[PDB]
């Protein structure tokens, strides 16, 4: 790998510089190099990995949705035949997106998840595995689409089981996992009732635990609780 000759600490330093410069592709390449050094990631370093790939794949998903919408309109009655170009370019963006997801899933499988023993790291990585299978599911249409969906579900479910056993209901990693698994139910699994039930139960059980928190922990937890409420407002 092109980052093999750079110090782990220098890769982390440059990931933070890339974030400041809004150079998220660079940030992801630096964090990929850091993971491939083979040492476990700290809490801060896990955040940097999350931020880098969230921004990269988020831009790809946004672009894929624009192109897919144009493609759908071109396949409407009375639409003028414009040739293969829209499908080709949507496929190009889709293929790059799948490549990014496969890269992230590869880092989690080699070997972030198997070395993560603490609940905070293990739930973080398993949620991430669910997320990037979810992005693969968003563009999937083939023989393995159901298996891609079930790979997302299985990763999310394992993260949920651990988070319920090992973390308080206000833990931001637990809350963020529930937020995203709820979105998986709504948008991927055709299960809006499960999506709404999960978001509501997660919100209510966090509300009841806020009294235990410091001001700074309260801020983190209520921030994600508001995202749960926002989704519930969208869905009801």
């Amino acid at each position: 790998g092109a980052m093999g000759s750079m110090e782990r600490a220098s890769l982390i330093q440059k990931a933070k510089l890339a974030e400041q410069a809004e150079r998220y592709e660079d940030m992801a390449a630096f964090m990929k190099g850091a993971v491939e050094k083979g040492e476990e990631l700290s809490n801060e370093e896990r955040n940097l990995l999350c931020v880098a790939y969230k921004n990269v794949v988020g831009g790809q998903r946004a672009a894929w949705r624009v192109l897919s919408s144009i493609e759908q309109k071109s396949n409407e009655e009375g639409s003028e035949e414009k040739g293969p170009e829209v499908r080709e370019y949507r496929e190009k963006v889709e293929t790059e997106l799948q490549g990014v997801c496969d890269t992230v899933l590869g880092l989690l499988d080699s070997h972030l998840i198997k070395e993560a023993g603490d609940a905070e790291s293990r739930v973080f990585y398993l949620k991430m595995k669910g997320d990037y299978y979810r992005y693969l599911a968003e563009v999937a249409t083939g023989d393995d689409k159901k298996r891609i969906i079930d790979s997302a579900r299985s990763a999310y479910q394992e993260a949920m089981d651990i988070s319920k056993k090992e973390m308080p209901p206000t833990n931001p990693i637990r809350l963020g996992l529930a937020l995203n698994f709820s979105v998986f139910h709504y948008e991927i699994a055709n299960s809006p009732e499960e999506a709404i039930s999960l978001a509501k139960t997660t919100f209510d059980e966090a509300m009841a635990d806020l009294h235990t928190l410091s001001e700074d922990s309260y801020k983190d937890s209520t921030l994600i609780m508001q995202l749960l409420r926002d989704n519930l407002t969208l869905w009801t």
């Binding site: 997320d131 979105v183 926002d230 989704n231």
Partner: peptide, 5 residues
């Protein structure tokens, strides 16, 4: 789209 983190 709905919020995710």
């Amino acid at each position: 789209f709905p919020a995710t983190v």
